[PDB]
């Protein structure tokens, strides 16, 4: 019955993930590999193709693309918030603790979910209607090319784990319910929720990836790696803010005193 309840929890999380996140890894892989009747994405691989694809998806291109990433991130933060509110126990936490969990969690989840839409060659954008190449993004002038590339670097390593949406739903939940985020007021209720989510994740991986005993331990390490990854992202965004002569208010709020 305990294991049965952990599977029920896994399924609840998956169902909530499907309601919260329009752009699933399943749907993204169907597009990337070509197994879809739907329209093929418009490929953007240089300045010329970017200009042509404007409708399918005075400021210079690098800035235009950076603002695009910002607006998608804003949309993603809202999706992640909705998903967080579906995790059993989350909305009953102290509201300021809920804020803290999102503040420190959202960019780790954004990196995770971005991987679902990436391969080694590029990233799906605009609900899969566009595909922008990694090479085009990396070639953008300093400091914007180096802002893009680490997201692909992480995706390549993370996608090697071959997680599916059912695995990801639980992985994301575990990350959000991290009891060691700076400034949390009531730690134990968060830790108790996370302990149960971790049990659900372990069972999920044992059943869904029986030939990969190492996967749970590897995912625990990825959660640790993501903190370092996001600290570097935030540093780079602080650099851009001071060295480039705009930042969305929601993102400004998240980065402030992070």
């Amino acid at each position: 019955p305990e294991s049965a309840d952990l599977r029920a929890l896994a399924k609840h999380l998956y169902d909530s993930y499907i309601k919260s996140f329009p752009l699933t890894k399943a749907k993204a892989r169907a597009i990337l590999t070509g197994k879809t009747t739907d329209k093929s994405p418009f490929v953007i691989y240089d300045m010329n193709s970017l200009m042509m694809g404007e409708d399918k998806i005075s400021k210079e291109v690098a800035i235009r693309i950076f603002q695009g990433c910002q607006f998608r991130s804003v949309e993603a933060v809202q999706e992640i918030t909705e998903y967080a509110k579906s995790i059993p126990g989350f909305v009953n936490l102290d509201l300021n603790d809920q804020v803290t969990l999102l503040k420190y969690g959202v960019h780790e989840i954004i990196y995770t979910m971005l991987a679902s839409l990436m391969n080694k060659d590029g990233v799906l954008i605009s609900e899969g209607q566009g595909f922008m190449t990694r090479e085009f993004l990396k070639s953008l002038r300093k400091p914007f090319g180096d802002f893009m590339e680490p997201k692909f670097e992480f995706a390549v390593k993370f996608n090697a784990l071959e997680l599916d949406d059912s695995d990801l739903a639980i992985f994301i939940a575990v990350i959000i319910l991290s009891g060691d985020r700076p400034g949390l007021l009531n730690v134990k209720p968060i830790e108790d929720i996370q302990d149960n989510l971790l049990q659900a994740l372990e069972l999920q991986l044992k059943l869904n990836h029986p030939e990969s005993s190492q996967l749970f331990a590897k995912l625990l390490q990825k959660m640790t790696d993501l903190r370092q990854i996001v600290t570097e992202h935030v540093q780079l965004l602080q650099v851009i803010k001071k060295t480039e002569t705009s930042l969305h208010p929601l993102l400004q709020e998240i980065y402030k005193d992070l």
Partner: peptide, 10 residues
């Protein structure tokens, strides 16, 4: 805050 507003919206 904006996060708080997002959290409170049913």
């Amino acid at each position: 805050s904006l996060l708080k507003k997002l959290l409170l919206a049913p």
